[PDB]
Design a binder for this molecule. Structure first.
Ligand SMILES: Cc1cc2nc3c(=O)[nH]c(=O)nc-3n(C[C@H](O)[C@H](O)[C@H](O)COP(=O)(O)O)c2cc1C
Ligand SMILES: O=C(Nc1c(F)c(F)c(-c2ccccc2)c(F)c1F)c1nsnc1O
Ligand SMILES: O=C(O)c1cc(=O)[nH]c(=O)[nH]1
Ligand SMILES: [Cl-]
Ligand SMILES: [Cl-]
Ligand SMILES: [Cl-]
Ligand SMILES: [Cl-]
Ligand SMILES: [Cl-]
Length: 352
């Protein structure tokens, strides 16, 4: 479309020339929360997983709406589901600025926000203000995830996550235990999270997913797969940003400390999805995330094992029109490869 090219070629590069990345992000959140924004979802794109219907499989990843401020505008942007957070129990400011950096030559970002968060209480009241509106959205196929973090100074990480389950669990369709911001400990932690979740009333009882790094050893991945199956965890989010720096980065800021996202992460993420799907025998839904910017990127993750995908960094470079672009391209590729819909493509590479 013309909007896609105007954002990609003129408006976004101009904004990025004028505004450092954090200021640009804060502007984006403000415009999105006000619905100041520039494709019709088809039956082909609908997915049923995690106990919910998803009108389309393209979600906004954690970190864009850390504090729950822009949820309705994100649905207006065309995302099939929204994940807010990470939210920490107490408020905290995060790292000093600058703490995010663009790598324009790499179509990548590096960030070290350090879990800046309004905290559970503020976000709780924010979501309560729209709780019934969200109930209708979810019933209409637009679910809400909440990603839970822990405070920097906390001495008892499992209790931080337990607090998040109790406070925001009742407001979420799914919860994310993000143990991956840049075996028996994980079993202990997840047992406690699942017990707290199971103690919520049924109408307020969310799915629980674990979000992992792209930087794990083979042993780590095998151990996570084992614990997730043993405990009955509902899903995996694969992956967070990477602390690696692939050979070939050109950005001047490539050696900043932080998590790398965008195109250089893409195929590391896709391979991690592929491995986790095989290690769980296809029985544990996966939300695939990392360097998704096109319909081909999305379908590669779906064929590798993802039931849903998310993006963030692509929005920062290409702007809101990228969402409809990904969905349009995904639908066209599904038809070209002979899938009746998204659901038939999930894990297809493992059946070749
Ligand atoms: C600026 C920024 C902040 C992020 N903060 C979070 C966060 O609070 N919690 C989380 O689980 N991931 C967070 N992420 C990771 C994204 O959710 C996603 O896993 C990662 O960026 C890969 O997707 P992408 O390449 O499409 O950006 C953040 C990413 C960015 C770029
Ligand atoms: O969020 C960002 N940009 C950014 C932006 F500056 C926008 F104006 C809109 C935007 C434009 C029109 C309506 C709503 C948001 C946006 F989505 C963005 F991602 C961003 N994060 S790191 N570097 C960046 O440029
Ligand atoms: O620094 C953060 O808050 C953050 C960054 C990131 O890339 N992933 C995450 O989970 N948190
Ligand atoms: Cl802090
Ligand atoms: Cl920068
Ligand atoms: Cl509590
Ligand atoms: Cl409630
Ligand atoms: Cl680092």
């Amino acid at each position: 479309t013309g909007d896609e090219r105007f954002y990609a070629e003129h408006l976004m590069p101009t904004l990025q020339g004028l505004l450092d990345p954090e200021s640009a992000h804060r502007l984006a959140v403000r415009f999105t929360s006000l619905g100041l924004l520039p494709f019709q979802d088809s039956d082909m794109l609908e997915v049923r997983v995690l106990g919910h219907k998803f009108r389309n499989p393209v979600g906004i990843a954690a970190g864009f709406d850390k504090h729950g401020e822009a949820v309705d505008g994100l649905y207006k942007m065309g995302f099939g589901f929204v994940e807010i957070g990470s939210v920490t129990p107490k408020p905290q400011e995060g790292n000093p600025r600058p703490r995010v950096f663009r790598l324009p030559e790499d179509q990548a970002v590096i960030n070290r926000y350090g879990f800046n968060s309004h905290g559970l209480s503020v976000v709780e009241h924010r979501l309560r203000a729209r709780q019934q509106k969200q109930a209708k959205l979810t019933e209409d196929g637009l679910p809400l995830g909440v990603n839970l973090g822990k405070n920097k100074t906390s001495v008892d990480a499992a209790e931080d996550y337990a607090e998040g389950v109790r406070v925001l669990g009742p407001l979420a369709d799914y919860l994310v235990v993000n143990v991956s911001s840049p075996k028996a400990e994980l079993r202990r932690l997840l047992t406690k999270v699942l017990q707290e979740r199971d103690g919520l009333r049924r109408v307020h009882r969310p799915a629980v997913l674990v979000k992992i790094a792209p930087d794990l050893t083979s042993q780590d991945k095998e151990d996570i797969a084992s614990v997730v199956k043993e405990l009955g965890i509902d899903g995996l989010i694969v992956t967070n940003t990477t602390v690696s720096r692939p050979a070939g980065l050109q950005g001047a800021l490539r050696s900043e400390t932080g998590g790398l996202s965008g195109k250089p992460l893409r195929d590391l993420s896709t391979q991690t999805i592929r491995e986790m799907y095989a290690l769980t025998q296809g029985r544990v839904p996966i939300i695939g995330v990392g360097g998704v910017s096109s319909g081909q990127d999305a379908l590669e993750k779906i064929r590798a094992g993802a039931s849903l995908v998310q993006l963030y960094t692509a929005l920062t470079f290409w702007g809101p029109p990228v969402v409809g672009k990904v969905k349009r391209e995904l639908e066209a590729l599904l038809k070209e490869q002979g899938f009746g819909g998204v659901t038939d493509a999930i894990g297809a590479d493992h059946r070749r």
